[PDB]
Amino acid sequence: GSVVKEKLEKALIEVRPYVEYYNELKALVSKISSSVNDLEEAIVVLREEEKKASEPFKTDIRILLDFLESKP
DSSP states (O other), rough: OTTTTHHHHHHHHTTTOOOOEEEEHHHHHHHHHOSSSHHHHHHHHHHHHHHOOOHHHHHHHHHHHHHTTTTO
């Protein structure tokens, strides 16, 4: 796996009380971190995952996604 996976594992825990379908995000992030080489590659992929998703799984993805980007 990539060093991307670690930053993604940190993100999982922090947004965990906010995100519904944490298990689903957990399977998605387990997939993408083995596919993407950069954290920026994980971000843009999750910007598609959001579009492909529907609420509240679209709310799940955006919370972790943004948190990676570190947008205030």
